[PDB]
Amino acid sequence: NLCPFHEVFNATTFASVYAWNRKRISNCVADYSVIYNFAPFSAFKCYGVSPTKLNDLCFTNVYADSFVIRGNEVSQIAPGQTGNIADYNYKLPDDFTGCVIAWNSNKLDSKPSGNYNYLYRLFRKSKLKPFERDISTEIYQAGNKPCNGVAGPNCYSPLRSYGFRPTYGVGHQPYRVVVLSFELLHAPATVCGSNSE
Amino acid sequence: DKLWILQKIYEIMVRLDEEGHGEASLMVSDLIYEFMKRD
Ligand code: NA
């Protein structure tokens, strides 16, 4: 009945960005304020619509993608961006019309000897397409010699852990990110802003 | 050429991490991305 945003934003742990999570939201009413005030946000940019305007609108589906990246990487979660995250982990299309929301999660995700559970992809043969999710573990081949599934010279594992610690500078602290996408098919719009109809 | 220096960078990123220099490791991570994206 009421859209379960709390459970997206307030989940105990989040996904790694390379293995980003997607939650489908359907058949419910949405006050998009329970969100606007969930936490103090470091980012809240909508592209097509705006929050207040959202409380009037109905969609077929909303998708909430969520993950953890570094503070300095948050700016990659925007249309037309390039970089390690946009290229190889999570890519927005240029014609994106939803919202990108980020906040500091240093208290939740940092650990004294470092949190090695959150990962990112460092090595890829090419850029992701919008909304692609690559969860492969192929050893990457850097040189002219084939790796034959063996880690070594010019043959590297593709993923790294972030190793978040509370004492890092804020740019290297973990941020939780929620990307809302608003889908309008030719179909009954089952996800409605709280001041519609 | 390109590859020897890539290997060394990778190794220092790894070595930085195991000696408690996580943040520095992360910054070398960024250099790898930059260097491999390139020419
Ligand atoms: Na940034």
How would you describe the overall organization of this protein?
The PDB classes it as viral protein/inhibitor. The entry lists the keywords RBD, viral protein-inhibitor complex. The assembly is dimeric. The complex is a heterodimer of chains A (197) and B (39). With 197 residues, chain A is mainly beta. Chain A has one domain: Spike protein, C-terminal core receptor binding subdomain (Alpha-Beta Plaits), CATH 3.30.70. In chain A, 9% of the residues lie in helices and 27% in strands. Chain A has four helices and twelve strands. Chain A has a five-stranded antiparallel sheet with strand order 1-5-11-6-3. A three-stranded mixed sheet of chain A has the order 2-12-4, with no helix packed on it. Chain A has a two-stranded antiparallel ribbon with strand order 7-10. The radius of gyration of chain A is 18 Å and the shape is globular. With 39 residues, chain B is mostly helical. Chain B has one domain. Chain B contains two helices and no strands. The longest helix of chain B has 17 residues. Chain B is flat. The two termini of chain B are 12 Å apart. The interface between A and B is medium-sized, with 19 and 15 residues. Sodium ion binds next to loops of chain A.
Structural domain tally of chain A: 1
Protein structure class of chain B: mainly alpha
Percent of residues in helices of chain A comes to under 10%
Alpha carbon gyration radius of chain B: 10 Å
Number of strands of chain B: 0
Overall structural domain count of chain B: 1
The biggest beta sheet of chain A, please? Answer: 5 strands, antiparallel
Bound molecules: sodium ion
How would you sum up the major sheet of chain B? none
Shape of chain B: flat
